[PDB]
Amino acid sequence: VLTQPASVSGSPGQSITISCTGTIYDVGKFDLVSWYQHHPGKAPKYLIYEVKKWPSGVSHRFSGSKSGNTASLTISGLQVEDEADYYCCSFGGSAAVVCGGGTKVTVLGQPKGAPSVTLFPPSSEELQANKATLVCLISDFYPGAVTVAWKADSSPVKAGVETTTPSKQSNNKYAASSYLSLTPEQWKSHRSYSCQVTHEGSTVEKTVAPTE
Amino acid sequence: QVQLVQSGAEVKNPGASVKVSCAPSGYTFTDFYIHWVRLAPGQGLEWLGWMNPKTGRTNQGQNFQGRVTMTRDTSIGTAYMELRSLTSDDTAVYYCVTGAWISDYYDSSYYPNFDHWGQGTLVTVSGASTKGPSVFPLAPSSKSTSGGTAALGCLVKDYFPEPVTVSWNSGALTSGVHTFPAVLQSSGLYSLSSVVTVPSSSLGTQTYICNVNHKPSNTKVDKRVEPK
Ligand code: NA
Ligand code: NA
Ligand code: NA
């Protein structure tokens, strides 16, 4: 693997550079470094090849260079649409290619938001099937980093919790969800259950109780 | 118009093998190297190998040697990559890509010049067994039921593999629908939820049905979501 910074950030209009560090056997050996831009949901796109050359149709806001065992992709006129994962690949010696871990580009200045949290108790039907799931749905938060804790009555609960990583919504804020699995007896034998969602600036907690 | 046509998504048990095909069109198949790469979670872009479609000569990444085989059938312009002894590390999207032009005068097999990409093939490695979902209603609040708006939904529980799709009222209801990405549970099964916000003045008269499609198990359920 070639080593790339996990994350690079910039403001719109600004220039950012993404590094790609190899060894004497690969990056430093030849002028055979390429870069690819990946928007998840689409196949990666050819951006740069042979260190600094452009494939047809690619914007010249992206430029590539190399010094020693380190290749660099520079993005000028930074736009929000440049948010993507960027990967470098190189000739790796012994007729092989080696690629990098990727770099996530974040464009700064985007609208922040607190999470909206909706908590559903187990349905009557699920209980009647001798199962119970609490459903905690979390949306509209930015930046996309949240921690979700559950409580039974006023005490932390870790067993039976399943929580997703945040994923981007259509409006570029994030959504996540968390599920607490209980037996119907556990659901009914407690005062309350709570889903508490901590974001950078606030904690939002929703509670449900079997006595409705 | 170049297009690289890959075989469809596969679901495999640990220890099994997978073979993915790639049929490139829009140019002469034997004129360019074929490479296979993958995008795997927390490993980034990984190179599996190259194949010369003219000769069948190949080379594999050193971390794939002994468990990947690349071949081709020129008569149908199709390349194959087989990966053996699958584990969770192999859950990834696999791409066939075009590489450099093949010359008699110089070796360009190892040029990482991937101009054209296949649509990708998802392989999911899991010991889970195919299973349709249980669908439970997420009833609107007793309290939100009062003019205004209410959130209601469907809990699509314990299915495998992905994907499920959810529509509401046969797609006649789209405004305010949010279907959340599934969670992969410790059991190896997925659950997801889909919620729609409707005017609370509407609850009880207007019928809300979530249409859950789980093609991998050939099941569809249309679930009515009612107050209470
Ligand atoms: Na090199
Ligand atoms: Na949002
Ligand atoms: Na109850």
Side-chain angles (χ1 to χ4, degrees), chain B residues 95-158:
Chain B
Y95 290 96
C96 176
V97 303
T98 64
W101 186 78
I102 302 173
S103 175
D104 282 320
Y105 293 98
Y106 61 96
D107 186 1
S108 54
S109 65
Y110 50 78
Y111 291 13
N113 295 2
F114 309 142
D115 282 89
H116 303 282
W117 290 64
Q119 84 276 25
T121 297
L122 184 66
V123 342
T124 306
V125 182
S126 167
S129 204
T130 296
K131 174 189 175 297
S134 292
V135 183
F136 299 115
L138 296 174
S141 170
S142 304
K143 309 162 167 161
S144 293
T145 306
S146 269
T149 74
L152 60 85
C154 283
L155 177 295
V156 183
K157 184 181 170 197
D158 296 336

XYZ file of all heavy atoms in Angstrom, chain B residues 95-158:
470
model
N -13.406 -4.063 -9.629
C -13.495 -3.419 -10.936
C -12.509 -4.063 -11.900
O -11.345 -4.316 -11.534
C -13.157 -1.934 -10.819
C -14.190 -1.106 -10.099
C -14.051 -0.821 -8.750
C -15.289 -0.582 -10.779
C -14.980 -0.039 -8.086
C -16.222 0.201 -10.122
C -16.057 0.464 -8.776
O -16.993 1.230 -8.122
N -13.002 -4.357 -13.098
C -12.174 -4.616 -14.268
C -11.872 -3.242 -14.841
O -12.771 -2.394 -14.921
C -12.996 -5.423 -15.285
S -12.212 -5.776 -16.869
N -10.628 -2.984 -15.222
C -10.302 -1.718 -15.871
C -9.421 -1.943 -17.098
O -8.720 -2.966 -17.194
C -9.603 -0.731 -14.917
C -10.465 -0.460 -13.681
C -8.250 -1.292 -14.484
N -9.444 -0.991 -18.023
C -8.536 -1.041 -19.167
C -7.214 -0.439 -18.715
O -7.202 0.508 -17.927
C -9.036 -0.253 -20.421
O -9.124 1.147 -20.127
C -10.373 -0.771 -20.925
N -6.106 -0.985 -19.205
C -4.809 -0.398 -18.937
C -4.177 0.113 -20.224
O -4.881 0.494 -21.161
N -2.849 0.102 -20.277
C -2.128 0.711 -21.389
C -2.299 -0.087 -22.685
O -2.673 -1.264 -22.661
C -0.648 0.866 -21.049
N -2.012 0.557 -23.811
C -2.014 -0.113 -25.111
C -0.880 -1.140 -25.131
O 0.197 -0.898 -24.577
C -1.812 0.925 -26.213
C -1.941 0.402 -27.612
C -3.098 0.122 -28.286
C -0.872 0.125 -28.516
N -2.808 -0.332 -29.545
C -1.447 -0.338 -29.715
C 0.520 0.212 -28.422
C -0.677 -0.709 -30.823
C 1.284 -0.154 -29.515
C 0.686 -0.609 -30.703
N -1.117 -2.284 -25.768
C -0.106 -3.337 -25.830
C 0.777 -3.204 -27.074
O 0.294 -3.292 -28.213
C -0.753 -4.725 -25.831
C -1.619 -4.912 -24.584
C 0.307 -5.832 -25.916
C -2.415 -6.196 -24.641
N 2.073 -3.009 -26.840
C 3.063 -2.830 -27.906
C 4.024 -4.007 -27.923
O 4.256 -4.624 -26.883
C 3.862 -1.551 -27.648
O 4.913 -1.384 -28.584
N 4.591 -4.309 -29.090
C 5.641 -5.320 -29.182
C 6.991 -4.726 -28.787
O 7.951 -5.454 -28.542
C 5.741 -5.882 -30.613
C 4.655 -6.907 -30.932
O 4.332 -7.743 -30.056
O 4.127 -6.872 -32.067
N 7.053 -3.399 -28.722
C 8.323 -2.685 -28.562
C 8.690 -2.307 -27.134
O 9.848 -1.986 -26.855
C 8.319 -1.410 -29.405
C 8.313 -1.650 -30.892
C 7.130 -1.610 -31.616
C 9.490 -1.912 -31.572
C 7.120 -1.826 -32.980
C 9.489 -2.131 -32.938
C 8.301 -2.086 -33.635
O 8.291 -2.301 -34.999
N 7.710 -2.316 -26.237
C 7.967 -1.967 -24.845
C 6.903 -2.551 -23.922
O 5.764 -2.797 -24.330
C 8.061 -0.444 -24.652
C 6.801 0.305 -25.026
C 5.854 0.645 -24.069
C 6.558 0.667 -26.342
C 4.693 1.331 -24.423
C 5.407 1.353 -26.702
C 4.484 1.683 -25.741
O 3.341 2.355 -26.110
N 7.288 -2.775 -22.676
C 6.381 -3.360 -21.695
C 5.564 -2.265 -20.997
O 6.111 -1.437 -20.281
C 7.204 -4.163 -20.691
C 6.354 -4.938 -19.709
O 5.103 -4.892 -19.787
O 6.961 -5.597 -18.836
N 4.252 -2.257 -21.213
C 3.396 -1.282 -20.543
C 2.381 -1.964 -19.629
O 1.408 -1.346 -19.215
C 2.684 -0.397 -21.564
O 1.989 -1.181 -22.514
N 2.603 -3.244 -19.336
C 1.703 -4.007 -18.464
C 1.497 -3.350 -17.107
O 0.424 -3.462 -16.513
C 2.227 -5.431 -18.257
O 3.454 -5.445 -17.553
N 2.528 -2.673 -16.618
C 2.517 -2.175 -15.254
C 2.237 -0.681 -15.191
O 2.407 -0.073 -14.136
C 3.846 -2.502 -14.555
C 5.040 -2.102 -15.375
C 5.453 -0.778 -15.434
C 5.736 -3.041 -16.120
C 6.536 -0.403 -16.198
C 6.826 -2.678 -16.884
C 7.221 -1.356 -16.916
O 8.304 -0.981 -17.675
N 1.812 -0.089 -16.310
C 1.351 1.299 -16.289
C -0.006 1.359 -15.590
O -0.962 0.738 -16.061
C 1.174 1.867 -17.706
C 2.442 2.083 -18.507
C 3.657 1.544 -18.098
C 2.420 2.827 -19.679
C 4.816 1.736 -18.840
C 3.569 3.026 -20.423
C 4.765 2.479 -19.993
O 5.918 2.663 -20.735
N -0.110 2.131 -14.487
C -1.380 2.232 -13.757
C -2.293 3.263 -14.409
O -2.777 4.189 -13.744
C -0.943 2.734 -12.376
C 0.228 3.615 -12.684
C 0.940 2.962 -13.866
N -2.513 3.091 -15.706
C -3.254 4.045 -16.517
C -4.635 3.499 -16.836
O -4.861 2.951 -17.911
C -2.482 4.328 -17.813
C -1.160 5.017 -17.557
O -0.789 5.266 -16.401
N -0.430 5.320 -18.630
N -5.554 3.654 -15.891
C -6.848 3.008 -15.978
C -7.902 3.967 -16.515
O -8.612 4.616 -15.742
C -7.232 2.467 -14.602
C -6.153 1.618 -13.979
C -5.907 1.672 -12.622
C -5.368 0.783 -14.767
C -4.913 0.906 -12.050
C -4.366 0.006 -14.199
C -4.144 0.067 -12.827
N -7.982 4.040 -17.844
C -8.866 4.978 -18.541
C -10.340 4.651 -18.359
O -11.158 5.539 -18.119
C -8.570 4.977 -20.043
C -7.344 5.781 -20.401
O -6.235 5.202 -20.398
O -7.482 6.991 -20.696
N -10.684 3.376 -18.500
C -12.091 2.976 -18.475
C -12.322 1.935 -17.403
O -11.499 1.051 -17.212
C -12.506 2.419 -19.841
C -12.274 3.378 -20.965
N -13.121 4.434 -21.224
C -11.282 3.455 -21.886
C -12.663 5.120 -22.257
N -11.549 4.542 -22.677
N -13.455 2.051 -16.718
C -13.786 1.212 -15.580
C -15.107 0.480 -15.815
O -16.054 1.058 -16.364
C -13.913 2.093 -14.329
C -12.594 2.652 -13.859
C -11.780 3.531 -14.529
C -11.933 2.356 -12.621
N -10.650 3.785 -13.780
C -10.728 3.084 -12.603
C -12.252 1.550 -11.522
C -9.833 3.019 -11.529
C -11.359 1.487 -10.467
C -10.169 2.221 -10.477
N -15.169 -0.785 -15.399
C -16.414 -1.532 -15.403
C -17.367 -0.947 -14.375
O -16.999 -0.025 -13.645
N -18.595 -1.457 -14.317
C -19.578 -0.850 -13.425
C -19.341 -1.279 -11.973
O -19.929 -0.706 -11.048
C -21.019 -1.150 -13.879
C -21.579 -2.502 -13.405
C -21.185 -3.660 -14.303
O -20.163 -3.615 -15.008
N -22.007 -4.704 -14.299
N -18.457 -2.259 -11.774
C -18.131 -2.737 -10.448
C -18.969 -3.958 -10.159
O -20.101 -4.086 -10.650
N -18.393 -4.874 -9.401
C -19.082 -6.067 -8.929
C -18.947 -6.158 -7.423
O -17.831 -6.281 -6.875
C -18.473 -7.347 -9.522
O -18.627 -7.342 -10.953
C -19.156 -8.592 -8.936
N -20.069 -6.112 -6.730
C -19.995 -6.250 -5.281
C -19.900 -7.731 -4.896
O -20.708 -8.542 -5.337
C -21.206 -5.584 -4.613
C -21.206 -5.586 -3.079
C -20.079 -4.717 -2.523
C -22.558 -5.104 -2.550
N -18.888 -8.103 -4.116
C -18.940 -9.415 -3.498
C -19.020 -9.289 -1.978
O -18.261 -8.547 -1.347
C -17.846 -10.419 -4.000
C -17.233 -9.969 -5.327
C -16.803 -10.677 -2.967
N -19.987 -9.987 -1.400
C -20.197 -9.932 0.037
C -19.870 -11.299 0.607
O -20.427 -12.312 0.189
C -21.644 -9.538 0.377
O -21.962 -8.310 -0.295
C -21.810 -9.349 1.903
N -18.924 -11.341 1.537
C -18.522 -12.616 2.106
C -19.119 -12.736 3.498
O -18.873 -11.902 4.372
C -16.996 -12.772 2.160
C -16.631 -14.144 2.708
C -16.412 -12.592 0.738
N -19.920 -13.765 3.717
C -20.614 -13.846 5.005
C -21.083 -15.257 5.238
O -21.419 -15.953 4.289
C -21.813 -12.899 5.001
O -22.671 -13.153 6.105
N -21.117 -15.674 6.497
C -21.674 -16.968 6.833
C -23.186 -16.924 6.960
O -23.810 -17.959 7.194
N -23.785 -15.740 6.803
C -25.243 -15.625 6.899
C -25.941 -16.360 5.759
O -25.380 -16.548 4.674
C -25.673 -14.177 6.914
N -27.181 -16.760 6.006
C -27.969 -17.457 5.000
C -29.109 -16.544 4.534
O -29.662 -15.793 5.342
C -28.542 -18.731 5.606
O -28.826 -19.691 4.610
N -29.449 -16.620 3.249
C -30.511 -15.806 2.654
C -31.806 -15.922 3.444
O -32.209 -17.026 3.830
C -30.788 -16.233 1.209
O -29.624 -15.982 0.415
C -31.982 -15.456 0.627
N -32.443 -14.782 3.704
C -33.640 -14.759 4.532
C -34.423 -13.492 4.256
O -33.852 -12.413 4.199
C -33.274 -14.802 6.010
C -34.478 -14.623 6.943
C -34.064 -14.462 8.394
C -35.269 -14.150 9.292
N -35.923 -12.854 8.937
N -35.730 -13.633 4.070
C -36.588 -12.482 3.866
C -36.842 -11.774 5.174
O -36.713 -12.363 6.243
N -37.227 -10.493 5.099
C -37.403 -9.694 6.312
C -38.725 -9.914 7.029
O -39.716 -10.320 6.418
C -37.374 -8.264 5.778
C -37.957 -8.378 4.386
C -37.425 -9.702 3.866
N -38.732 -9.641 8.326
C -39.972 -9.439 9.041
C -40.235 -7.960 8.938
O -39.322 -7.154 9.144
C -39.825 -9.812 10.515
O -39.648 -11.201 10.661
N -41.470 -7.586 8.615
C -41.794 -6.177 8.479
C -42.764 -5.766 9.570
O -43.872 -6.302 9.653
C -42.399 -5.868 7.102
C -42.664 -4.373 6.962
C -41.444 -6.344 5.991
N -42.347 -4.810 10.396
C -43.187 -4.333 11.494
C -43.552 -2.862 11.300
O -42.762 -2.086 10.760
C -42.483 -4.543 12.833
C -42.185 -5.981 13.131
C -40.877 -6.431 13.225
C -43.219 -6.889 13.316
C -40.602 -7.764 13.490
C -42.954 -8.219 13.580
C -41.637 -8.658 13.668
N -44.765 -2.475 11.729
C -45.162 -1.084 11.540
C -44.499 -0.204 12.586
O -44.352 -0.622 13.744
C -46.681 -1.121 11.788
C -46.861 -2.240 12.764
C -45.822 -3.275 12.382
N -44.081 0.994 12.181
C -43.677 2.008 13.143
C -44.823 3.005 13.213
O -44.908 3.937 12.410
C -42.370 2.682 12.714
C -41.170 1.724 12.670
C -39.923 2.404 12.084
C -40.869 1.156 14.056
N -45.723 2.785 14.166
C -46.946 3.576 14.272
C -46.663 5.034 14.611
O -45.729 5.340 15.359
C -47.866 2.982 15.314
N -47.486 5.940 14.070
C -47.338 7.355 14.418
C -47.695 7.567 15.882
O -48.478 6.797 16.449
C -48.371 8.047 13.513
C -49.392 6.972 13.219
C -48.569 5.715 13.096
N -47.131 8.605 16.488
C -47.384 8.890 17.896
C -48.865 9.114 18.177
O -49.587 9.651 17.325
C -46.609 10.139 18.322
O -47.029 10.557 19.609
N -49.306 8.711 19.371
C -50.647 9.040 19.870
C -50.819 10.546 19.962
O -51.944 11.063 19.895
C -50.856 8.485 21.286
O -50.631 7.092 21.363
N -49.694 11.236 20.139
C -49.673 12.667 20.446
C -49.585 13.521 19.193
O -50.193 14.593 19.116
C -48.468 12.980 21.330
C -48.339 12.087 22.551
C -46.921 12.148 23.123
C -46.846 11.512 24.511
N -45.442 11.154 24.873
N -48.826 13.030 18.219
C -48.692 13.722 16.965
C -50.001 13.622 16.230
O -50.222 14.319 15.283
C -47.557 13.127 16.121
O -46.308 13.342 16.703
N -50.861 12.732 16.663
C -52.124 12.558 16.033
C -52.965 13.711 16.522
O -53.546 13.635 17.550
C -52.760 11.176 16.406
O -51.852 10.123 16.110
C -53.966 10.904 15.621
N -52.960 14.819 15.819
C -53.745 15.937 16.236
C -53.451 16.959 15.192
O -52.539 17.719 15.380
C -53.252 16.435 17.623
O -53.911 15.854 18.724
N -54.183 17.030 14.093
C -53.858 18.011 13.060
C -52.382 17.835 12.719
O -51.898 16.703 12.796
N -51.664 18.916 12.418
C -50.235 18.896 12.147
C -49.646 17.745 11.355
O -50.255 17.266 10.433
N -48.449 17.326 11.721
C -47.797 16.184 11.046
C -47.388 15.070 12.010
O -47.170 15.294 13.187
C -46.544 16.538 10.201
O -45.453 16.808 11.041
C -46.758 17.703 9.290
N -47.274 13.868 11.463
C -46.850 12.693 12.216
C -45.822 11.938 11.408
O -45.906 11.894 10.183
C -48.035 11.787 12.509
N -44.864 11.324 12.094
C -43.945 10.391 11.446
C -44.432 8.958 11.652
O -44.800 8.562 12.766
C -42.552 10.548 11.994
N -44.444 8.185 10.573
C -44.729 6.758 10.669
C -43.807 6.013 9.719
O -43.250 6.610 8.788
C -46.202 6.463 10.362
C -46.770 6.853 8.996
C -46.519 5.773 7.945
C -48.259 7.146 9.096
N -43.654 4.711 9.925
C -42.737 3.982 9.079
C -42.900 2.486 9.140
O -43.887 1.983 9.678
N -41.923 1.791 8.562
C -41.840 0.340 8.601
C -40.448 -0.057 9.037
O -39.462 0.518 8.568
C -42.145 -0.266 7.230
S -43.917 -0.273 6.889
N -40.394 -1.009 9.969
C -39.157 -1.631 10.437
C -38.967 -2.908 9.613
O -39.770 -3.829 9.708
C -39.304 -2.043 11.909
C -38.198 -2.787 12.686
C -37.930 -4.195 12.130
C -36.901 -2.006 12.839
N -37.915 -2.955 8.810
C -37.632 -4.102 7.954
C -36.514 -4.891 8.636
O -35.356 -4.486 8.637
C -37.217 -3.647 6.537
C -37.004 -4.849 5.621
C -38.287 -2.710 5.948
N -36.875 -6.006 9.250
C -35.991 -6.616 10.235
C -35.430 -7.970 9.822
O -36.160 -8.837 9.334
C -36.764 -6.774 11.549
C -35.974 -7.311 12.702
C -36.904 -7.421 13.892
C -36.273 -8.173 15.038
N -37.333 -8.611 15.991
N -34.133 -8.153 10.071
C -33.472 -9.459 9.985
C -33.566 -10.096 8.612
O -34.135 -11.185 8.452
C -33.992 -10.435 11.054
C -33.676 -9.973 12.463
O -32.715 -9.192 12.642
O -34.396 -10.374 13.396
